[PDB]
């Protein structure tokens, strides 16, 4: 029942990305086609149905978030030295790092342009602080590569900044753009945060438990690159595992890494990570149970159920 509004969002998106400059125009089309299904607008629209839902206002929140994410991919590819992303070539490959920087910056400034159609200063306060928090998390990620002496709260802050916050504010900003009451949009902020935290924990579990075929990339790529995730945190309580995990660095090969992944899977780290993920999912269901029943609460409840 959202397909018509999601189509509105995409037409706006497509029009906010044209350019009289052919290079920028063509780079814009390339970002339009990146990614699979647009996930963030759904959270925005469902949370907007808890106020005076109006596609002609709330669409600007969805376009802004889509554009922001687009800006991030272009810069992520330079940070990653990625020549291909999700099976397709990258902005920086087609052109170069400098062009990727400028196109990404052009996209991020364009999203701020878009968000200023929401003249609610509270929306800008929430979004601007989110962006600062995401950048801080990307910086702390570099600092903590291969840091096997980190504690759980380090990891929790990392995945809040990377994933949860953005679901959290997609929800809150949808409700705020539609005049929802304070009690309603703050409860939607907490639902999105709790749902995102549990999603990212699942994602990190799957990076060890799926086959190469399901992932479309080798198993354990978070750990190979130095990003400690939740199963590694529990596995690090096993001293013999920790003696190996401490030796992983940027020159470790896939073949050295995979016997370690098999050991992790023979501890109780996977199951311990599942439990934390489901504690978050339960806290997300609590917050939903404070909202009015209806089509929107049901759909968000569906989305959390598919995540567990």
């Amino acid at each position: 029942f959202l397909n018509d509004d999601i189509d509105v969002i995409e037409r706006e998106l497509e029009q906010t990305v044209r350019s009289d400059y052919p290079l920028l125009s063509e780079a814009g089309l390339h970002l339009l086609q990146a990614g699979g299904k647009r996930i963030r607008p759904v959270f925005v629209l469902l949370s907007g149905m808890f106020g005076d839902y109006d596609i002609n206002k709330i669409k600007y929140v969805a376009v802004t978030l889509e554009m922001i994410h687009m800006a991030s991919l272009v810069h992520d590819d330079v940070i990653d030295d990625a020549e291909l992303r999700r099976g397709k070539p990258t902005i920086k490959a087609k052109w170069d790092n400098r062009i990727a920087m400028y196109t990404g910056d052009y996209m991020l400034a364009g999203s701020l342009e878009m968000m200023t159609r929401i003249n609610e200063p509270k929306a800008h306060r929430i979004l601007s602080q989110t962006i600062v928090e995401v950048c801080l998390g990307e910086i702390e990620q570099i600092k903590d590569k291969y840091n096997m002496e980190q504690n759980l709260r380090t990891y929790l802050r990392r995945i809040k900044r990377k994933t949860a916050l953005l679901i959290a504010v997609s929800c809150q900003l949808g409700a705020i753009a539609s005049g929802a009451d304070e009690k309603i949009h703050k409860a939607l902020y907490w639902f999105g945060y709790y749902v995102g935290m549990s999603y990212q924990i699942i994602d990190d579990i799957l990076d060890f438990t799926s086959t190469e075929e399901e992932l479309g990339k080798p198993v354990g790529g978070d750990l190979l690159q130095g990003n400690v995730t939740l199963p590694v945190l529990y596995a690090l309580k096993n001293p013999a595992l920790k003696n190996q995990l401490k030796l992983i660095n940027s020159e470790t090969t896939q073949e050295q890494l995979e016997p370690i992944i098999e050991e992790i899977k023979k501890t109780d780290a996977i199951e311990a990570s599942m439990a934390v993920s489901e504690m978050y999912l339960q806290k997300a269901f609590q917050k939903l149970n404070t909202l009015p029943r209806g089509r929107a609460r049901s759909s968000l409840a569906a989305i959390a159920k598919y995540i567990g």
Partner: protein
């Protein structure tokens, strides 16, 4: 001593800007942003006469300088295929520092609840980036086009911020001065056009910047004295 006072105002602005840009982990791996004190000077004079509260001036000046820092930081992201491992992480933190600085200025303006200034700056940042690409892709064609792009990249913040407050003078002054500064501090522009010599382009630019300083600012006002001596230093 009005020279003393304006140098003390610039020194305070410089310190608040540096504290706002600093990050303990960035500090340990990449070089601090290189603050253009001419732009600092000109943003301070512009926000002197803008219709804003006195105790907002410093925040507006820092905001504008945060945008400049974001733009300048990303100019230092290299395009070298392979590199060293300590040099790759430096490149990664340089990409992140520029995006961080963008987040900070948007966050500063949100706290002041100035949504329209956000629109103005975002519009300026979009055109500055379009014309960086144009200049870098060597996509121009004329003496007119090339120079129109150099002036946009180098002065469009002053342009758009001045328009926002309906202030004259700042568009032409900053354009003349910073185009001159960028060209003085390029050697291949003559390989996609020409018109006069390298030394004729520069000294014509010096004359335009010299003239605007003397015309668009009060005689021996502290900002004129500073800028006129700065023109001489840049020429030398």
């Amino acid at each position: 001593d009005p020279m003393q006072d304006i140098y003390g105002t610039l020194a305070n602005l410089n310190t608040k800007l540096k504290q706002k840009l600093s990050h303990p982990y960035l500090a340990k791996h990449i070089s601090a942003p290189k603050i253009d004190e001419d732009k600092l000077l000109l943003f301070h004079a512009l926000f002197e006469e803008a219709d804003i509260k006195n105790n907002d001036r410093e925040n507006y000046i820092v905001t504008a300088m945060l945008v400049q820092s974001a733009l300048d930081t990303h100019d230092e992201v290299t395009t070298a295929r392979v590199i060293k491992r300590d040099e790759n992480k430096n490149r990664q933190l340089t990409v992140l520092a520029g995006d961080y600085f963008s987040g900070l200025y948007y966050s500063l303006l949100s706290e002041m609840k100035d949504i329209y200034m956000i629109r103005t700056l975002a519009t300026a940042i979009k055109e500055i980036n379009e014309h960086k690409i144009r200049l870098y892709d060597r996509s121009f064609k004329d003496e007119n086009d090339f120079f129109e792009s150099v002036g946009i990249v180098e002065s469009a913040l002053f342009h758009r911020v001045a328009e926002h407050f309906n202030l004259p003078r700042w568009k032409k002054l900053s354009s003349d001065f910073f185009v001159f500064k960028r060209l003085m501090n390029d050697v291949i522009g003559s390989f996609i056009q020409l018109g006069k010599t390298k030394e004729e382009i520069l000294e014509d630019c010096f004359k335009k910047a010299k003239n605007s300083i003397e015309s668009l600012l009060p005689l021996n006002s502290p900002i004129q004295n500073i800028l006129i001596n700065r023109l001489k230093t840049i020429s030398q």
